[PDB]
Write an enzyme that holds these catalytic residues in place. Structure first.
Site, mmCIF file in Angstrom:
data_model
loop_
_atom_site.group_PDB
_atom_site.id
_atom_site.type_symbol
_atom_site.label_atom_id
_atom_site.label_comp_id
_atom_site.label_asym_id
_atom_site.label_seq_id
_atom_site.Cartn_x
_atom_site.Cartn_y
_atom_site.Cartn_z
ATOM 1 N N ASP A 274 27.145 38.036 33.621
ATOM 2 C CA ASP A 274 28.034 38.710 32.689
ATOM 3 C C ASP A 274 28.815 37.674 31.890
ATOM 4 O OD1 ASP A 274 29.497 40.843 31.479
ATOM 5 O OD2 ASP A 274 31.022 40.749 33.010
ATOM 6 N N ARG B 154 35.308 36.618 27.362
ATOM 7 C CA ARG B 154 36.282 37.359 28.154
ATOM 8 C C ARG B 154 36.228 36.968 29.636
ATOM 9 N NH1 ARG B 154 32.039 40.980 26.911
ATOM 10 N NH2 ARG B 154 30.818 41.246 28.812
ATOM 11 N N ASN B 155 35.182 36.264 30.060
ATOM 12 C CA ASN B 155 35.118 35.774 31.430
ATOM 13 C C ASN B 155 35.393 34.275 31.528
ATOM 14 O OD1 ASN B 155 34.803 38.081 32.886
ATOM 15 N ND2 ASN B 155 32.571 38.144 32.756
ATOM 16 N N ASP C 24 34.644 35.220 36.540
ATOM 17 C CA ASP C 24 34.064 36.560 36.344
ATOM 18 C C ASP C 24 35.124 37.589 36.738
ATOM 19 O OD1 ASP C 24 32.641 38.966 36.027
ATOM 20 O OD2 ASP C 24 30.994 38.483 37.327
HETATM 21 C C1 LIG Z 1 29.612 39.757 42.803
HETATM 22 S S1 LIG Z 1 29.844 40.924 41.518
HETATM 23 O O1 LIG Z 1 29.082 40.493 40.391
HETATM 24 O O2 LIG Z 1 29.618 42.231 42.047
HETATM 25 N N1 LIG Z 1 31.411 40.858 41.083
HETATM 26 C C2 LIG Z 1 31.899 41.945 40.214
HETATM 27 C C3 LIG Z 1 33.416 41.981 40.121
HETATM 28 C C4 LIG Z 1 33.963 40.598 39.778
HETATM 29 C C5 LIG Z 1 33.452 39.570 40.767
HETATM 30 N N2 LIG Z 1 33.931 38.226 40.463
HETATM 31 C C6 LIG Z 1 33.794 37.203 41.311
HETATM 32 O O3 LIG Z 1 33.216 37.295 42.391
HETATM 33 C C7 LIG Z 1 34.363 35.859 40.861
HETATM 34 C C8 LIG Z 1 33.750 34.785 41.750
HETATM 35 C C9 LIG Z 1 33.624 33.477 41.000
HETATM 36 C C10 LIG Z 1 32.654 33.494 39.814
HETATM 37 C C11 LIG Z 1 32.829 32.215 39.013
HETATM 38 C C12 LIG Z 1 31.867 32.128 37.836
HETATM 39 C C13 LIG Z 1 30.434 32.213 38.303
HETATM 40 C C14 LIG Z 1 30.203 33.483 39.102
HETATM 41 C C15 LIG Z 1 31.201 33.634 40.257
HETATM 42 N N3 LIG Z 1 35.819 35.805 40.873
HETATM 43 C C16 LIG Z 1 36.497 35.304 39.832
HETATM 44 O O4 LIG Z 1 35.912 34.878 38.840
HETATM 45 C C17 LIG Z 1 37.994 35.265 39.934
HETATM 46 C C18 LIG Z 1 38.776 34.935 38.827
HETATM 47 C C19 LIG Z 1 40.148 34.763 38.950
HETATM 48 C C20 LIG Z 1 40.781 34.908 40.182
HETATM 49 C C21 LIG Z 1 42.257 34.621 40.344
HETATM 50 N N4 LIG Z 1 42.851 33.812 39.284
HETATM 51 C C22 LIG Z 1 43.325 34.343 38.147
HETATM 52 O O5 LIG Z 1 43.280 35.539 37.901
HETATM 53 C C23 LIG Z 1 43.857 33.380 37.157
HETATM 54 C C24 LIG Z 1 43.757 32.024 37.029
HETATM 55 N N5 LIG Z 1 44.295 31.563 35.848
HETATM 56 C C25 LIG Z 1 44.746 32.658 35.229
HETATM 57 C C26 LIG Z 1 45.364 32.818 33.961
HETATM 58 C C27 LIG Z 1 45.716 34.074 33.532
HETATM 59 C C28 LIG Z 1 45.489 35.204 34.352
HETATM 60 C C29 LIG Z 1 44.901 35.059 35.562
HETATM 61 N N6 LIG Z 1 44.520 33.800 35.994
HETATM 62 C C30 LIG Z 1 40.007 35.291 41.274
HETATM 63 C C31 LIG Z 1 38.636 35.474 41.152
HETATM 64 C C32 LIG Z 1 31.940 39.537 40.712
#
Ligand SMILES: CS(=O)(=O)N1CCC[C@H](NC(=O)[C@H](CCC2CCCCC2)NC(=O)c2ccc(CNC(=O)c3cnc4ccccn34)cc2)C1
Length: 273
Positions: A130, A134-135, A148
């Site tokens: 995805d 926006r990601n 993501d």
């Molecule tokens: C498995 S799935 O496809 O079913 N699923 C669907 C639903 C989404 C899931 N995402 C995920 O697993 C990813 C796992 C990593 C991803 C990395 C790229 C390659 C693929 C894997 N979680 C996040 O991206 C994530 C993001 C931010 C934060 C906390 N930090 C903040 O918010 C922050 C930090 N700085 C700021 C500035 C302003 C506001 C907020 N922030 C926590 C988690 C995937």
């Protein structure tokens, strides 16, 4: 466990809390995503798998899992904090140099980091699925972290096609084979990178294929399959010279094997810097 007693609340952002940490070895800022303790079991499982996936991902251009707090409740994950929020809002607030204002070279340096980040993930056969501005998150001096945020933020609902009882699909970023099969690959990630590079070059002034309906975007995917000349393409953005445009066009090759690998895409966008 990371210690909760080392996280000093700064600001709100299931909640995400800006926090600072003294002597983690200026104080370090970290982002802390907190799972509500009324969270359902499905939500808790998703949070534990999000922790597992992030744990293995260690690259300058991918969001980084700094620590967790899971032994007690509430469940916490701690990432690095990116000051300028996601890349879509960031560029929407900018205009191309002739404000604020961003030079053409800086746009490529942004685009190259996303490419360097996708390249890292491709060395793990990790498919993003995805990819879109926006990601991506923006830190200091235009550093870019891929992340993501998932598919259910109101601000971006329009980028998603939903049918009852089906996986929600980011169709305007999706390779034709993806739209027709649900088959996501690094090659389809390349296609979406082409649409991400298009957005960045548009400074995010419009949604891909924005004058066309969902159904027309799906119909377009069928025309790539039919391959009798009817398939259409995202136009070249104002900021985009025709050479960079021809890189985007290669990302949208019918045959996933003719699409540029991220190593090459990164190499070509990182050249200007
Ligand atoms: C498995 S799935 O496809 O079913 N699923 C669907 C639903 C989404 C899931 N995402 C995920 O697993 C990813 C796992 C990593 C991803 C990395 C790229 C390659 C693929 C894997 N979680 C996040 O991206 C994530 C993001 C931010 C934060 C906390 N930090 C903040 O918010 C922050 C930090 N700085 C700021 C500035 C302003 C506001 C907020 N922030 C926590 C988690 C995937």
């Amino acid at each position: 466990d990371f210690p909760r007693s080392r996280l000093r609340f700064k600001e709100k952002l299931g909640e995400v809390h800006l926090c600072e940490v003294d002597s983690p070895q200026h104080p370090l800022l970290v982002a802390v995503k907190i799972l509500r303790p009324d969270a359902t079991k499905n939500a808790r499982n998703d949070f534990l798998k999000e922790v597992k996936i992030m744990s293995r991902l260690k690259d300058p251009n991918i969001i980084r899992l700094l620590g967790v707090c899971v032994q007690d409740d509430p469940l916490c994950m701690i990432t690095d904090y990116m000051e300028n929020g996601d890349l879509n809002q960031f560029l929407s607030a900018h205009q191309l140099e002739d404000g604020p204002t961003i030079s053409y070279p800086m746009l490529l340096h942004v685009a190259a980091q996303i490419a360097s980040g996708m390249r890292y993930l491709a060395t793990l056969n990790f498919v993003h699925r995805d990819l879109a501005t926006r990601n991506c998150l923006v830190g200091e001096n235009f550093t870019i972290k891929i992340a993501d945020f998932g598919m259910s933020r109101n601000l971006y609902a329009g980028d998603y096609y939903r049918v009852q009882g089906r996986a929600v699909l980011p169709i305007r970023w999706m390779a034709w084979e993806c739209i027709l099969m649900g088959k996501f690959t690094t090659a389809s990630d390349v296609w979406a990178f082409g649409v991400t590079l298009w957005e960045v070059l548009m400074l995010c002034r419009a949604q891909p294929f924005g004058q066309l309906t969902d159904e027309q975007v799906i119909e377009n995917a069928g025309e790539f399959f039919r391959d009798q000349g009817r398939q259409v393409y995202l136009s070249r953005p104002p900021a985009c010279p025709q050479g960079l445009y021809e890189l985007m066009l290669r990302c949208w090759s019918r045959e996933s094997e003719q699409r540029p690998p991220f190593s090459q895409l990164h190499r070509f966008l990182a050249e200007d810097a």
